[PDB]
Coordinates of C-alpha atoms (C1' of nucleotides) in Angstrom, one line a residue:
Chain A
X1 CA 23.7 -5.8 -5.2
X2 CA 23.4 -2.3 -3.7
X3 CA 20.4 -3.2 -1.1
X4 CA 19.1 -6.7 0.1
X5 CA 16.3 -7.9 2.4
X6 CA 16.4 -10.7 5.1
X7 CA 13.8 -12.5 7.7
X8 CA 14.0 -13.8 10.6
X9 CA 12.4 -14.7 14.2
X10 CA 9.1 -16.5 13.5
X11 CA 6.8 -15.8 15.7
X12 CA 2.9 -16.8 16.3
X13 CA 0.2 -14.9 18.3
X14 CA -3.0 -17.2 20.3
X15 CA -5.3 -18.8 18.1
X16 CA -8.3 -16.0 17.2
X17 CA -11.1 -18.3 18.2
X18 CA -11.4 -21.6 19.8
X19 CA -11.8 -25.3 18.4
X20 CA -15.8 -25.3 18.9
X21 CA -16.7 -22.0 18.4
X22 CA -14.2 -22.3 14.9
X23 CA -15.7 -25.7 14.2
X24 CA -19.6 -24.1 14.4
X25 CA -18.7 -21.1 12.9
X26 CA -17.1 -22.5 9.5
X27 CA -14.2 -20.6 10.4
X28 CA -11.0 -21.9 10.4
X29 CA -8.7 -22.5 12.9
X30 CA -5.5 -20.4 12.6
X31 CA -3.4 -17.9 14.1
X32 CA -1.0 -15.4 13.3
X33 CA 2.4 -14.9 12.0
X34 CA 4.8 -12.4 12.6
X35 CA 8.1 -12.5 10.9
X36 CA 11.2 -10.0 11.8
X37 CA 12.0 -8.6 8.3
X38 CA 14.9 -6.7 7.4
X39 CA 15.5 -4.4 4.5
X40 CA 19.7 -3.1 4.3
X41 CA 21.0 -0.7 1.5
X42 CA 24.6 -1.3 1.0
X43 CA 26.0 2.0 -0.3
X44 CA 24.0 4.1 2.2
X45 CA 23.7 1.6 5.1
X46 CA 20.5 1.2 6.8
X47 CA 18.5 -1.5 8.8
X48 CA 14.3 -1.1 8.3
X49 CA 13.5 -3.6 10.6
Chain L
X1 CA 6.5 -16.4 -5.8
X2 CA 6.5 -13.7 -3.3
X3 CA 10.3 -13.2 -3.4
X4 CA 9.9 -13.2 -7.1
X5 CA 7.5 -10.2 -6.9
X6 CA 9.8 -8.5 -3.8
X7 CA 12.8 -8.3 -6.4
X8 CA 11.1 -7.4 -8.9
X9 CA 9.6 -4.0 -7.6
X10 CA 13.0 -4.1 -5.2
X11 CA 14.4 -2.2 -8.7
X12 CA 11.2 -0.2 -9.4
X13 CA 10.4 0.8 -6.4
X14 CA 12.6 4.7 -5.7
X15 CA 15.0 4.2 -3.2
X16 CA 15.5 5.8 0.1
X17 CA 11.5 5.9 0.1
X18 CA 10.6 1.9 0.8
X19 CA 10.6 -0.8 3.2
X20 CA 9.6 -4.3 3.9
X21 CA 6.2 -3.1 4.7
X22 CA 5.8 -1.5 1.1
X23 CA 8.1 -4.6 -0.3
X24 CA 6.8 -7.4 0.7
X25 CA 3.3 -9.4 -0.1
X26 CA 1.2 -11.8 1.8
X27 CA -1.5 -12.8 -0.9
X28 CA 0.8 -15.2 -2.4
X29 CA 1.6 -17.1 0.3
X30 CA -1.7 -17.7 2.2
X31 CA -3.2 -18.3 -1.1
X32 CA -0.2 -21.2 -1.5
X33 CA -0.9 -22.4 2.2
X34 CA -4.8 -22.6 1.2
X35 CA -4.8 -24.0 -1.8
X36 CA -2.6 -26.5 -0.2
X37 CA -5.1 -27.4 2.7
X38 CA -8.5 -27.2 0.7
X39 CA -8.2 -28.7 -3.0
X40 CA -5.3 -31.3 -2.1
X41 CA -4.9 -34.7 -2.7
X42 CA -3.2 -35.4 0.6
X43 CA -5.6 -32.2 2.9
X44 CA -7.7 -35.4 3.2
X45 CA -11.4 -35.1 4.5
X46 CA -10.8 -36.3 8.2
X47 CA -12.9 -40.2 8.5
X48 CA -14.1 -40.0 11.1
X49 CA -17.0 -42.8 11.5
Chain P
X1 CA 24.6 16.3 16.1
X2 CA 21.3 14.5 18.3
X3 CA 21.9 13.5 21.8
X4 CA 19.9 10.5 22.9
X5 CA 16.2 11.5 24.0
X6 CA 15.9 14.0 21.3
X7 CA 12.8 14.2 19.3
X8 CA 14.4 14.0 16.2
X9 CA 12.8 14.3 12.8
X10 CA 13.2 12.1 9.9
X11 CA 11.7 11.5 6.4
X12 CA 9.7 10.5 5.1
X13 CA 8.1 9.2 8.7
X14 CA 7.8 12.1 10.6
X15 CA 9.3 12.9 14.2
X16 CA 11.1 10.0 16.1
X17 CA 12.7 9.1 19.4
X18 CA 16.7 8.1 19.4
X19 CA 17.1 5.2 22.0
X20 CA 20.4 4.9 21.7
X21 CA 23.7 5.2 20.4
X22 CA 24.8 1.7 19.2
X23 CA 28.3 1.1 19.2
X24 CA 27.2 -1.7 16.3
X25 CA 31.0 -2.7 14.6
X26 CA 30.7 -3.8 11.1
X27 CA 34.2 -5.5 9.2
X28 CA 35.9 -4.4 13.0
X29 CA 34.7 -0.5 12.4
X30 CA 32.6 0.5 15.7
X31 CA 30.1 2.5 13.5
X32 CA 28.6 4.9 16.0
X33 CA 25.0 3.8 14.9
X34 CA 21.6 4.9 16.5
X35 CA 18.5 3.6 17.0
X36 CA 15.7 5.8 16.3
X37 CA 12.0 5.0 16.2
X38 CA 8.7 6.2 15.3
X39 CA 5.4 5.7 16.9
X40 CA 3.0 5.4 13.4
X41 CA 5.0 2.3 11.8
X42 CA 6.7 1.0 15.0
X43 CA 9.6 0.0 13.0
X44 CA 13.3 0.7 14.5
X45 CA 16.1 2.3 12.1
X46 CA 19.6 2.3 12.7
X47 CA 21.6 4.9 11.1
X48 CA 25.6 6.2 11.3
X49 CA 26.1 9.4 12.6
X50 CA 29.2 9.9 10.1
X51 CA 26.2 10.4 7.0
X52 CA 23.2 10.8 9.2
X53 CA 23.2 14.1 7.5
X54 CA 23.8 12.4 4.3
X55 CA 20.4 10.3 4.7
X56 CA 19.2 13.5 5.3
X57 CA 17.8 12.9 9.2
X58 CA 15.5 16.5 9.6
X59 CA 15.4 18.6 13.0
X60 CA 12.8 20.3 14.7
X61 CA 10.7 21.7 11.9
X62 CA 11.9 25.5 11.6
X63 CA 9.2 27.8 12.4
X64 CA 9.8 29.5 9.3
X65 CA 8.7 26.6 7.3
X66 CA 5.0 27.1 8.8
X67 CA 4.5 30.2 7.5
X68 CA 6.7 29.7 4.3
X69 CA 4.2 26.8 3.3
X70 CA 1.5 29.1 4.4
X71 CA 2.8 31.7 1.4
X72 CA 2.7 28.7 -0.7
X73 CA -1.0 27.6 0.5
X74 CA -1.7 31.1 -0.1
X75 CA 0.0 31.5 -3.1
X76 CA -1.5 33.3 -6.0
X77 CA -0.7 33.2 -9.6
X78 CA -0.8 29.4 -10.3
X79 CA -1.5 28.2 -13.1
X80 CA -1.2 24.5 -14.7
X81 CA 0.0 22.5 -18.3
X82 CA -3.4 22.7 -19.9
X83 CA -3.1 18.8 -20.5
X84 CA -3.9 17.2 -16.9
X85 CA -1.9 14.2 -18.3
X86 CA 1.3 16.3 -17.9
X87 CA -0.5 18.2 -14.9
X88 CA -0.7 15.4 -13.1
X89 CA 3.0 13.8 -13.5
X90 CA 4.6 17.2 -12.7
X91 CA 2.7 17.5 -9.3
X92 CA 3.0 14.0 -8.7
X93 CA 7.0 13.9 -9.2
X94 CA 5.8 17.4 -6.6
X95 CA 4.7 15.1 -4.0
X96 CA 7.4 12.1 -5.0
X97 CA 9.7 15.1 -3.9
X98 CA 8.7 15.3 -0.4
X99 CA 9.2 18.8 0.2
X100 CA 7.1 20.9 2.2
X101 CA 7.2 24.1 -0.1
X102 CA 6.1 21.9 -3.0
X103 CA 3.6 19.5 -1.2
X104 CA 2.1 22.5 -0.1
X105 CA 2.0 24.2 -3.7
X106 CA 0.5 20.9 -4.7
X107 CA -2.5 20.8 -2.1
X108 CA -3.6 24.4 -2.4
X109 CA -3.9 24.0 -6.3
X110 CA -5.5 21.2 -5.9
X111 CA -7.8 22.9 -3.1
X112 CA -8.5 25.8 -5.6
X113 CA -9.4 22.7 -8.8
X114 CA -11.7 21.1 -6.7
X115 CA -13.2 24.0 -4.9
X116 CA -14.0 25.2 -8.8
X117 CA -14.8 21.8 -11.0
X118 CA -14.9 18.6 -9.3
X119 CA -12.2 16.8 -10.4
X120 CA -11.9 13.0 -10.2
X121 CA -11.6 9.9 -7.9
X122 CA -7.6 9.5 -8.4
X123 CA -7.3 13.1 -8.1
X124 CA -9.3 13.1 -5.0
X125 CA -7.2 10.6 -3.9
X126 CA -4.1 12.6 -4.6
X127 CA -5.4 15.4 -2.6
X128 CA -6.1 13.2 0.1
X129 CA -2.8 11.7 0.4
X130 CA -0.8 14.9 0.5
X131 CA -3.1 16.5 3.3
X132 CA -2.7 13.8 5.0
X133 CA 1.0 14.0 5.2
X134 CA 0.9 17.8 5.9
X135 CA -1.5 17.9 8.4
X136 CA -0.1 15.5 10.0
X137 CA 3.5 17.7 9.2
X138 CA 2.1 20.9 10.6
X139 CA 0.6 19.0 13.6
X140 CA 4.0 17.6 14.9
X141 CA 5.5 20.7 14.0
X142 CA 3.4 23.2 15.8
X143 CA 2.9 20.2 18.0
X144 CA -1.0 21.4 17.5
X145 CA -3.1 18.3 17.7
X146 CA -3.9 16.8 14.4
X147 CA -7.7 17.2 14.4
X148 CA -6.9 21.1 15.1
X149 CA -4.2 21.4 12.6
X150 CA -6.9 20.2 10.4
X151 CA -9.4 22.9 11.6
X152 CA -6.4 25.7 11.2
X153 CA -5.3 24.4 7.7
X154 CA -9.2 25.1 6.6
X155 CA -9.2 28.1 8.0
X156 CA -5.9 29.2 6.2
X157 CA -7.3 27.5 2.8
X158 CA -9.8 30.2 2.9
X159 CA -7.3 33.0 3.9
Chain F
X1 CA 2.3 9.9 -30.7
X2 CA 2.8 6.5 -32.0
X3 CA 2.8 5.3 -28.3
X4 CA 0.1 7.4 -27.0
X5 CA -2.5 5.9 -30.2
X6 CA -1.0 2.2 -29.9
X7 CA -1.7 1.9 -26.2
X8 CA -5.7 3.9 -27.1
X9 CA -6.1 1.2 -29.5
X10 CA -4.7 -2.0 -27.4
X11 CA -6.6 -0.8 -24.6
X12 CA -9.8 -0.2 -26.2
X13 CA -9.4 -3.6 -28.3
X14 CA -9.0 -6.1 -25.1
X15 CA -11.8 -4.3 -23.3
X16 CA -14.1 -4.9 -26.4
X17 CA -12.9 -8.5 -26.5
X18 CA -12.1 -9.4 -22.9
X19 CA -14.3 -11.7 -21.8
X20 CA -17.2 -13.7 -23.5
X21 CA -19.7 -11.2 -22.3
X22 CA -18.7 -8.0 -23.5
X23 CA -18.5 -5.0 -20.6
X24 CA -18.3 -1.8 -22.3
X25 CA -15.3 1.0 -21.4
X26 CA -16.3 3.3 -18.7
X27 CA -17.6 0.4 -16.7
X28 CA -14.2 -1.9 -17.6
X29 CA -12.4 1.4 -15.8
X30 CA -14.1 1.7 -12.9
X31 CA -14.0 -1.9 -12.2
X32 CA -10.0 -1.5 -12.6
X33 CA -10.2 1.0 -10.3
X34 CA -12.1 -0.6 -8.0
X35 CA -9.5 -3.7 -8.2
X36 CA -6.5 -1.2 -8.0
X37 CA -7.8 0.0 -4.7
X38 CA -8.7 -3.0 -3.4
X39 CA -5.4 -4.7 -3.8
X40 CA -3.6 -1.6 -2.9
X41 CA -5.3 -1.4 0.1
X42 CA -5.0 -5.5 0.6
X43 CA -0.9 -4.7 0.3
X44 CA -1.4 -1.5 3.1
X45 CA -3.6 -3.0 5.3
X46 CA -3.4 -7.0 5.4
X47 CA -7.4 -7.5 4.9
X48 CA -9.4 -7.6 2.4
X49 CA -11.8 -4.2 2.6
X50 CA -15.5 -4.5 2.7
X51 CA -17.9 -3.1 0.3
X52 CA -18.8 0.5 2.7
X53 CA -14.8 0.4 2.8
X54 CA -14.5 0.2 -1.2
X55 CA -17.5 2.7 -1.3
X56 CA -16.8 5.4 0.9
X57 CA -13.1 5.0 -1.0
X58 CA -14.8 5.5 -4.2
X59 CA -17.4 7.9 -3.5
X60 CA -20.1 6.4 -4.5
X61 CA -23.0 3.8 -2.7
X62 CA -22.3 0.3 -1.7
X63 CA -25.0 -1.0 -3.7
X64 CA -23.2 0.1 -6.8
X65 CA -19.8 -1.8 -5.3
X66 CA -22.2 -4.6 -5.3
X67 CA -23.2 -4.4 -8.6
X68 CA -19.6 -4.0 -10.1
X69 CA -19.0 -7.2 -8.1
X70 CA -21.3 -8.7 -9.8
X71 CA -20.9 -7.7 -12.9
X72 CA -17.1 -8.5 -12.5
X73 CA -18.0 -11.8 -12.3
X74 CA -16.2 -14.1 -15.2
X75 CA -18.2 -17.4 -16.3
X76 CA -17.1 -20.7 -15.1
X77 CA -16.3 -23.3 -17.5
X78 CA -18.7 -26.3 -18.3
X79 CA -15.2 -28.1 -19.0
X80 CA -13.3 -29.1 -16.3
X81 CA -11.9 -32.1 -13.9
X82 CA -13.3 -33.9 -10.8
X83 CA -15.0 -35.5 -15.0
X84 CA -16.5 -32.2 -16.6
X85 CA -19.7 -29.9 -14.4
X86 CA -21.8 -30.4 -17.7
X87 CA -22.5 -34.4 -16.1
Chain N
rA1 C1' -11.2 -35.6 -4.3
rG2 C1' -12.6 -39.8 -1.4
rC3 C1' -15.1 -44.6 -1.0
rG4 C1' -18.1 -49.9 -1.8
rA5 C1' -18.6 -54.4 -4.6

RNA sequence: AGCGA
């Protein structure tokens, strides 16, 4: 119980490649995700964000 | 699973030395998210006729 | 002890940039916090002033500590536990350590091993993480361009 | 001493009895090292590396990181469900 | 895994 980690804030960047060009290149269509995450010591006290 | 592994090493790991970057892991969850979409009863092949 | 604006060291990640200091309360104590970030993992720490010494926030790197790791580079008399088992958990713990003396100890043995035998893929590896680290130490410290604090180191490692 | 010749023997006994074709020690160790690397560079950089990557990080040629691909390889099982691959 | 009789 001395440190503890949290999340928050998802968050997506555009698409890497487009529907057609995806669909002919077998990739697949995605994007990023980019979450906010948090790591806090309790004894010390800290925020790695 | 991920958070599973994150505690786990959260007590290994030395301390004032980490953060979420060294903490956390990705390769569960795509793997989950893409074994979900390809290999799924319901990640249906789109019938399109 | 740092205004806002300083360039501010901290480990293990090197120089930093304060941005400000938060007046972020916590159970209704207005913790005199600030926000201090570094350009390589472009993540933003908050820390009290009250223990920032206590986390152990560094300053501008003394110039002593150049030439005091440059004794250590040039260190003679070294010698090593003749098992490499225990060799390399004691230099490892070395680098685990942090410290710039020690690091310093480790990479110029190391230099002097492999310079001699040819030594081994996690060993090379070793090397390679702890000159990274300096060199990029001694760059931001003599504020000398990492690619030339390279070229200097080499030319030191020789003496 | 006990600890040091128990973990020589386990390791030296699951190598020799992995898989159902057998890969012999110093090639089992540089494959683990290979798959060390490549997951700890996975965790660092969010990609999987490619084979000049695991190469260059290994010192040696990427024709050889191709061949301990390969040779990493673990057969398939004629058993399985879809029905079994032996039909 | 999906589908026709």
């Amino acid at each position: 119980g001395s440190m503890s980690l949290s999340f928050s804030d998802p968050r997506f960047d555009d698409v890497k490649a487009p529907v057609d060009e995806c669909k002919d290149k077998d990739m697949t269509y995605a994007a990023p995700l980019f979450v906010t995450a948090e790591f806090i010591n309790n004894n010390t006290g800290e925020i790695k964000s | 699973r991920m958070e599973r592994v994150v505690r786990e090493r959260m007590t290994t790991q030395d301390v004032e030395a980490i953060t979420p970057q060294t903490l956390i892991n990705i390769r569960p969850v795509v793997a989950a998210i893409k074994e979900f979409f390809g290999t799924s009863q319901l990640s249906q092949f789109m019938d399109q006729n | 002890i740092f205004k806002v604006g300083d360039t501010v060291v901290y480990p293990h990640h090197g120089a930093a940039l304060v941005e400000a200091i938060e007046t972020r309360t916590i159970k209704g104590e207005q913790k005199e916090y600030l926000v201090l970030k570094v350009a390589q993992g472009d993540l933003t720490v908050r820390v009290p002033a009250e223990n920032a010494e206590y986390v152990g926030v560094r300053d501008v790197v003394g110039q002593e500590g150049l030439d005091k790791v440059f004794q250590v580079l040039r260190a003679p008399h070294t010698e090593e536990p003749t098992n490499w088992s225990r060799r390399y958990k004691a230099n490892l713990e070395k680098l685990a350590s942090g410290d710039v003396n020690k690091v310093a100890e480790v990479v110029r043995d190391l230099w002097r091993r492999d310079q001699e035998r040819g030594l081994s893929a996690g060993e090379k590896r070793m090397l390679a993480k702890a000159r990274q680290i300096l060199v990029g130490e001694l760059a931001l410290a003599e504020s000398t361009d990492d690619a030339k604090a390279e070229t200097i180191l080499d030319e030191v490692l020789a003496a | 001493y006990a600890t040091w010749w128990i973990r020589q023997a386990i390791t030296r006994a699951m190598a020799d009895q992995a898989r159902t074709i057998r890969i012999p020690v110093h090639m089992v160790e540089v494959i683990n090292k290979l798959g060390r690397i490549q997951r700890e560079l996975l965790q660092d950089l969010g990609r999987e590396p490619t084979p000049e990557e695991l190469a260059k990080e290994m010192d040696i040629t990427p024709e050889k990181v191709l061949e301990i691909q390969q040779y990493a390889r673990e057969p398939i099982s004629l058993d399985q469900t879809i029905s079994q691959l032996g039909d």
